[PDB]
Amino acid sequence: EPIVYLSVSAQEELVPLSEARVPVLDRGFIFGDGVYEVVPVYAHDGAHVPFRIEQHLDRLARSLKKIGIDNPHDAAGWRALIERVVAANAEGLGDGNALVYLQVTRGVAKRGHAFPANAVPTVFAMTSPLRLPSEEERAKGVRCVTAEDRCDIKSISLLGNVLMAQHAAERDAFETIQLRDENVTEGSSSNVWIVKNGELFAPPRRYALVEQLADECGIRFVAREISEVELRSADEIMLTSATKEILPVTSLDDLPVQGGKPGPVFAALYDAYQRAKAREFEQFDLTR
Amino acid sequence: FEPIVYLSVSAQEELVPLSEARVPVLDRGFIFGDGVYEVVPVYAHDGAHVPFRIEQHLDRLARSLKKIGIDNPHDAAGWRALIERVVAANAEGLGDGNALVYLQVTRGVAKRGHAFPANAVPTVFAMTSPLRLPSEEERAKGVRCVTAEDRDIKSISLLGNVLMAQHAAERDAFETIQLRDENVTEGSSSNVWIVKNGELFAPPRYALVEQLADECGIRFVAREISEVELRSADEIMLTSATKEILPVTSLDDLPVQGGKPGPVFAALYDAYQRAKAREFEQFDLTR
Missing domain, CATH: 3.20.10.10 (D-amino Acid Aminotransferase, subunit A, domain 2)
Known part of the structure; x- marks a missing residue:
């Protein structure tokens, strides 16, 4: 079972996935009000090595700034959190490649569209196996289709x-x-x-x-x-x-x-x- | 009075105090914003709480669900009964004030992957909230608006x-x-x-x-x-x-x-x- 990290309203936990739940008025659930970043973590010599971790964390910091959420961690803080979540999943990852999924939302508040005053960001981090494309996909290539880029509905x-x-x-x-x-x-x-x-x-x-x-x-x-x-x-x-x-x-x-x-x-x-x-x-x- | 809310996840339902209501982190409403909502006003009248244009609101909900390929969890009667239930559970708390019912449906919980998950079961969330209509002064004086262009980031x-x-x-x-x-x-x-x-x-x-x-x-x-x-x-x-x-x-x-x-x-x-x-x-x- 995946072990995940969740911080909500300034309380944090490191728990089995089945135990990780967020309040229904989290603005990530009600409004899609948040950002995410994915960091690949490659298997190498019995360790799990993040790739371009500094560039990924820089992008996460820019995404947060772009929507007015104060970054919950500095770079060292995010690295430590990533290191923690990967190590807690060591046995499940084995010697396979992995990814770390990071998500930050504006947090929990009374439903209302504009930014609430007293909101503490929610932070979710998890790791899962990463199956890179196959030798055969790379050798044969993949099939794509085209569509018009995508309003009429009340979505979340x-x-x-x-x-x-x-x-x-x-x-x-x-x-x-x-x-x-x-x-x-x-x-x-x-x-x-x-x-x-x-x-x-x-x-x-x-x-x-x-x-x-x-x-x-x-x-x-x-x-x-x-x-x-x-x-x-x-x-x-x-x-x-x-x-x-x-x-x-x-x-x-x-x-x-x-x-x-x-x-x-x-x-x-x-x-x-x-x-x-x-x-x-x-x-x-x-x-x- | 603590609001009582309805939540249905992975085909299990509960009517619980707001502080107790939580959804799995891999719910696609949380991860992908993959869902729709509808709001039904419920007006105070003669000691009761009366939904306004409930058939029109539920028809829009049904059309929106169909548009994004989520199976509709209820027929119109089923939705009306759920709404009636949520309002009655909150009767004490609403008092003689106006209210709204907020309904939200998501594609449900699965392994994170963008395309629709196989046999996903939709999540349903319903709650009431007090509704404060614009004041007699807001109506008398009017309100101030601004304009902006209708429109880069890895958002959820x-x-x-x-x-x-x-x-x-x-x-x-x-x-x-x-x-x-x-x-x-x-x-x-x-x-x-x-x-x-x-x-x-x-x-x-x-x-x-x-x-x-x-x-x-x-x-x-x-x-x-x-x-x-x-x-x-x-x-x-x-x-x-x-x-x-x-x-x-x-x-x-x-x-x-x-x-x-x-x-x-x-x-x-x-x-x-x-x-x-x-x-x-x-x-x-x-x-």
């Missing part, structure tokens, strides 16, 4: 969204509205709508609920690209999400949205949102 | 890489080489190199393969590699810490040139082994 690979939410928090902002090719896409955790001349717009697929609310109110809706210039000259801007319901945006990059007050299309859609709730409450009361 | 948000590794597996291939704007980017778990007229190329930003090239006298250039250039390359290679360097001799069922590994591969592979040899000799000397 959310490091992107985390960084955009942190981007907003750093600027004392509620949300980051993202642009691609001078067109509006979405917020880190919300959908974006605009109003011009009493009509409602969203980027091309919309969202059934808000479309239904617009319909109810007699407000025309069209999904089409919204340019950055159109966003900055909108009559209203709104955000929606399950947890935000619908909210007006009245300042954008520190400039006011039209007069800086919420507008009448926001007021109409917000009241319609509350009627949609009222109707579900009434259906609930009837069944009850 | 790897669901895209998983899907590209599985794409190769589905096709009995070793790796998927990705194209963007008809230029090569990278493999699901490797870097891609080509050779043309004895020169080595990689897409623009390995120090190691560049070192190996230099040792061999082989000119290296980082520049965009088009799909056309990839398909007509003299050699194609993949690199990673665990693959070292390997020759690609077939690409989408067409041979790479003659279909056999070429001389630049042979040179770089031997240089890779000399780099290992030197690290061993330095180790032996300090030992």
Whole structure:
């Protein structure tokens, strides 16, 4: 059985794999909020010798810096941890090649996208046998296929969204509205709508609920690209999400949205949102 | 009041205090970010807690699971019952406040490998949390937003890489080489190199393969590699810490040139082994 190292909330253990478990609100589990590095450790003369250990640890330090996690160890500290985990697995590795897998996450906190204040990184390290490609694979070569490089789903690979939410928090902002090719896409955790001349717009697929609310109110809706210039000259801007319901945006990059007050299309859609709730409450009361 | 959460791992389920709820470290939600989530608002009304648009939320969940090839653990009724259960277990704690239910499904626990594991059993996690809706003042005054560009690092948000590794597996291939704007980017778990007229190329930003090239006298250039250039390359290679360097001799069922590994591969592979040899000799000397 693999013996692994795990440090969570500043407590560490070196345990059989079957005993190693992480809290469900670790941001590595909820948000994919972490980095990893793999160090090959080659069998040689009855020892296990890490390869390019300094370059790998330098890359890990750069990955951590890139996402704002303070490195939990200096180079000597990581080497010692690697040495420890390999030696604890000596019998299982035998004289075969191995790899050391290192993972660091932003740690455990209440679920929320931006960086939490009081978080201590989680560190996981394990070693497993490494089977290099065969003489035959090397002699014959391998087969590859091509595909288009890869959004439409709510996945838990959310490091992107985390960084955009942190981007907003750093600027004392509620949300980051993202642009691609001078067109509006979405917020880190919300959908974006605009109003011009009493009509409602969203980027091309919309969202059934808000479309239904617009319909109810007699407000025309069209999904089409919204340019950055159109966003900055909108009559209203709104955000929606399950947890935000619908909210007006009245300042954008520190400039006011039209007069800086919420507008009448926001007021109409917000009241319609509350009627949609009222109707579900009434259906609930009837069944009850 | 300690929140009570639901957890199902490797086909075993429990309803436990939050402080007791933990998942195996090799859960693919932890290692690869390989999973989806849904949030259902649960509003306080007349002493009860009433889910809002629960059918729409569960339909989205079902579609997302299907999209990434995870078997859906419940039908709509089953999900509604689980949600009802989790909320009732937390009744005392929610009081007369609004709440949300957070549902998360991952591909489950296996040996670390990017492609889908055989007979994997999905992990399910559900919890409640208080929901504080925006204030009357936030609604009255509105909120402040900023803008940024929508977008390099070895992260554990790897669901895209998983899907590209599985794409190769589905096709009995070793790796998927990705194209963007008809230029090569990278493999699901490797870097891609080509050779043309004895020169080595990689897409623009390995120090190691560049070192190996230099040792061999082989000119290296980082520049965009088009799909056309990839398909007509003299050699194609993949690199990673665990693959070292390997020759690609077939690409989408067409041979790479003659279909056999070429001389630049042979040179770089031997240089890779000399780099290992030197690290061993330095180790032996300090030992």
